[PDB]
Design brief:
This is part of a larger assembly, with 13 protein chains of seven kinds. Chain A is an all-alpha fold and about 55 residues long. Chain B is built from four helices and two strands; from the N terminus they run H-H-H-E-H-E. A two-stranded antiparallel ribbon of chain B has the order 1-2. The longest helix of chain B has 14 residues. The two termini of chain B are about 20 Å apart. Chain D has about 130 residues and is an alpha+beta fold. Chain G is mostly helical and about 40 residues long. Classes of the chains: A mainly alpha (about 55), B mainly alpha (about 60), C mainly alpha (about 70), D alpha+beta (about 130), E mainly alpha (about 220), F mainly alpha (about 35), G mainly alpha (about 40). At the K-L interface, helix 1, helix 2 and helix 3 of K face helix 1, helix 2 and helix 3 of L. Chain E: InterPro entries: ATP_synth_F0_asu, ATP_synth_F0_asu_AS, ATP_synth_F0_asu_bact/mt, F0_ATP_A_sf.
Chain lengths: ~55, ~60, ~70, ~130, ~220, ~35, ~40, ~70, ~80, ~70, ~70, ~70, ~70
């Protein structure tokens, strides 16, 4: 956990993280995405709780 | 009339509407009950930790 | 050119139907103005200028047809 | 039910409670409602005006000081009033006129009081109308 | 390659550049154009949830999205002085409306079969009024079949024709007249006004198309 | 950067595609008939 | 008339555009949504 | 001047229709006036000049239509 | 060509009717705005651009009718 | 090529007569929108979209009238 | 034959007058929908679908008018 | 025979205006439907069929007008 | 002969426009009916006969217009 905090101190791409890097790091998110795509349920439960919509509607 | 924006609320409107008749009452109708209603001795004394308790202004 | 002037006069006669909109427009504008000032006298000072402007725009729309008919008269 | 029952209450002494009554005028903000009997449930804010109550005896005028004209499907007319106009003994021209003209000068004193003085003079003029 | 072919290939190139070329390296920041695309996606997805939602909105969201973007890119290239309204035939919108109505009817006859005929009798209307109700609703659906095309296509063509006629009739704007003051510049003001009107109308009618096809899909899938 | 994700294109969107095919076939049939030229 | 140049071609166009959209662009928005959800949760 | 005078008469008849809109204007202005004065008698004193101006402006359009019809007759 | 110009004038004169709808529309918008601002004064800042846009669109329809009349006249 | 063009222009006028309904329609839509946001300020974000929807639909009806006129013009 | 096509165009023009009713109808439908959402915002989800249905019916009436005009033309 | 078919077309064009009031009628019935439902959600089940019947045959009146136009044509 | 039939068809067309009033009227009848039954659910049984009677009378007026149009035609 010292290694974790030391990495997080200066290796935290908050505004410059690559989505391809995120996919390569964790294949679990890829597996989830293809599973839910092939299932047809495009909803991602719990997605408007923290992210706004600015909906003109 | 304008007892909400220019005025205050329905309570004071109705109270003053009744008080207009209460003050403009005949001596025969002027009894102890209407005299008690006419008298107003409640002073608005807000709380200290709630509204700083500035002064005991009239209600 | 007899039929030309004849139908020009006919078009001028029918071009005045646009004044109907100006008439019912001032109608409804002033009706709502009276209702609003009946709601509360305070809003008069802020609601009267827009009622006047709305009547002006309605009469301008009517004057559009009036001018077109005048073009179909002279 | 047969007829109509009216529940007229006043803080000093309640007047009516479940008494058979015919058409009763209920001056609201818009106008008075002459509820004959039964009637659809309603809720209307009462305005200072003449509340004329017919029974089998006579037609007595009751200038109301306000309240609500609320009705229920069981035909319960509970008029929660404050002050009534017993017959005509409450009539007095001079005090009402002088109170109106004396509240005219304070009709523009301080915001809420200024606005309410106008309504007080209005209900005084309603009293003048009821004076007959 | 005719005019329509080059127009469509240019539209495809620009629309794909707006997404795959906007991402310089596809960061997680979600830049202003990226956040605009995100907002559009969220708006179309909540059309889907609000108007066809309940069991299978997500399945039908993608066609709503794609039709919205196609109509958006078609309406965006409508006000440019040279911009031709996709060969200026507008029968393409009619074809889209017809094919969408046919697909909705096929979906209704597949997921409901003969029950689709019960949609003509929502709540009441007993036997004496049943034939009238079914005739009325069948004619309403037939009108719906042409509603979408004779709508966006009609408005686009009318805007283009207004554009052309306005530009033609003010050819003497400062050519030879002596009265070319601001009174003669008022036609420029109305041309500017119809620019703004055409833009707003195109956007709001793309929204109209999206909500109408969502409602049609809901009526097809859900019987009420 | 860009990857192919296999969303259902025919399992769910078959009626629209078959309607488009039918419309195209009808247009081709009526090109020599509904043209009056 | 001159109909066999834009109608069937237009159908091929919206078919390929629908395919490209649904298979490419919507997955990017979905991926960013799920990534924000994951690193937010 | 057979056809020309005929079309003049037809155009005057068609122009005569602006009075309907003028009448609706005056009428709904007075209707809102009545509703407002009944709602609050005090607001009547302020609204009455507003109603006067409103119906005068509404009748101005009817007068314009009448003049347009008149110039088509003589 | 006398009949052609005659019917051009007739068509323009009857096409001018759209200003009836334009005026009725702008004034409907103004009447609603008056009622809204009188009912609540605070909402004026948020309801004024709404009525401005509505009036603009209605007078735009009126201008469309006027331009139809003008193109029937001079075109 | 005389009577056909004449009746073409006449029918174009009889078709452009219909934009009155579209204008009054977008008007009443915006009017109810104003009244709704007036009764409740907080419902604006919900009543705006279907209101501009109705405006677009009525404008499209007016442009249907305009299209019927235009095929009788070009 | 020329008079036949002329009356075809005239009837097509007259066929479009009925569309203004469809426009004002869809508009008043959406106006009442605005008012209902104002009174009961929570009933919007239940109320919007048959609002779309009413728009569809009125636009269908307008489209019967439009198709009558179209078949009168071609 | 030219005039017969010409006036048949004219009468068909004038006859199809019946959809104007059919649309206005379905819209007015629907507007009161929305107002009542938003003012009283519990009345939905017993108001819906009657309103459906009402606007359905109100549009059927316009369908009768369309049938008159069709027989004028065919 | 042919002119008589022509004016017969045009009169049938201008008689078909009588149904607009029937449509708008049955609209207002069913609109008030819906509003009333939404206000108090207990009044529907009492108000249905009168509402349907007034509707039937309005439809009878519309049928009178249609019958006049038919006796014109046939």
């Amino acid at each position: 956990l010292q290694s974790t905090l030391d990495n997080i101190q200066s290796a935290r791409p908050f505004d410059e993280l690559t989505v391809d890097d995120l996919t390569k790091i964790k294949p679990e998110i890829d597996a989830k995405v293809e599973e839910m795509v092939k299932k047809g349920k495009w909803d991602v439960p719990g997605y408007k709780d923290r992210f706004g919509n600015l909906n003109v509607m | 009339s304008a007892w909400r924006k220019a005025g205050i609320s329905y309570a004071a409107y109705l109270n003053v509407a009744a008080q207009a008749i209460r003050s403009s009452l005949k001596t025969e109708l002027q009894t102890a009950s209407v005299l008690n209603r006419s008298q107003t001795d409640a002073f608005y004394t807000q709380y200290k930790n709630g509204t700083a308790a500035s002064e005991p202004t009239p209600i | 050119m007899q039929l030309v002037l004849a139908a020009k006069y006919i078009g001028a006669g029918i071009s005045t139907i646009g004044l109907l909109g100006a008439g019912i427009g001032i109608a409804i504008v002033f009706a709502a103005l009276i209702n609003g000032v009946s709601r509360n006298p305070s809003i008069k000072d802020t609601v009267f200028p827009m009622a006047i402007l709305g009547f002006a725009l309605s009469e301008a729309t009517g004057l559009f047809c009036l001018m077109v008919s005048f073009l179909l008269l002279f | 039910s047969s007829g109509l029952k009216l529940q007229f209450a006043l803080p000093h002494e309640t007047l009516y409670s479940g008494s058979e009554v015919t058409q009763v005028n209920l001056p609201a903000k818009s106008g008075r409602i002459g509820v004959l009997a039964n009637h659809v449930p309603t809720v209307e804010q009462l305005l200072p005006g003449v509340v004329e109550v017919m029974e089998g005896s006579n037609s007595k005028k009751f200038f109301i000081s306000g309240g609500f004209a609320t009705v229920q499907p069981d035909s319960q007319l509970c008029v929660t009033a404050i002050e009534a106009f017993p017959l005509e003994s409450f009539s007095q021209e001079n005090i009402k006129n002088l109170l109106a003209e004396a509240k005219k000068n304070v009709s523009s004193s301080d915001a809420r009081e200024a606005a309410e003085a106008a309504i007080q003079v209005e209900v005084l003029e309603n009293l003048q109308s009821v004076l007959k | 390659l005719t005019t329509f072919s080059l127009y469509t290939i240019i539209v495809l190139l620009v629309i794909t550049s707006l997404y795959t070329l906007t991402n310089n390296n596809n960061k997680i920041i979600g830049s202003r154009w990226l956040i605009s695309q995100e907002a559009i996606y969220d708006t179309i997805m909540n059309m889907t949830k609000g108007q066809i939602g309940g069991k299978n909105w997500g399945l039908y969201f993608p066609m709503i999205f794609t039709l919205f973007m196609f109509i958006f890119i078609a309406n965006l290239i409508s006000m440019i002085p040279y911009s031709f309204a996709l060969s200026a035939h507008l029968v393409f919108i009619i074809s889209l409306s017809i094919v969408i109505w046919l697909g909705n009817t096929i979906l209704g006859l597949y997921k409901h079969g003969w029950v689709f005929f019960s949609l003509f009798v929502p709540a009441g209307t007993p036997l004496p009024l049943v034939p009238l109700l079914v005739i009325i609703e069948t004619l309403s659906y037939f009108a719906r079949a042409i509603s979408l095309g004779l709508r966006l296509g009609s408005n686009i063509l009318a805007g283009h024709l207004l554009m052309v006629i306005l530009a033609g009739l003010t050819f003497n704007f400062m050519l030879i007249n002596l009265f070319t003051l601001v009174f003669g510049f008022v036609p420029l003001a109305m041309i500017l006004a119809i620019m703004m009107l055409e833009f707003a109308i195109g956007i709001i009618q793309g929204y109209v198309w999206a909500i109408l096809t969502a409602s049609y899909l809901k009526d097809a899938v859900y019987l009420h | 950067m860009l990857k192919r994700f296999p969303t259902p294109i025919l399992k769910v969107y078959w009626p629209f595609f078959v309607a488009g095919a039918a419309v195209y076939y009808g247009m081709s049939k009526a090109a020599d008939l509904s043209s009056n030229t | 008339f001159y109909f066999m140049n834009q109608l069937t071609y237009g159908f091929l166009l919206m078919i390929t555009l629908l395919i490209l959209f649904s298979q490419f662009f919507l997955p990017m928005i979905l991926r960013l949504y799920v990534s924000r959800l994951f690193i937010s949760k």
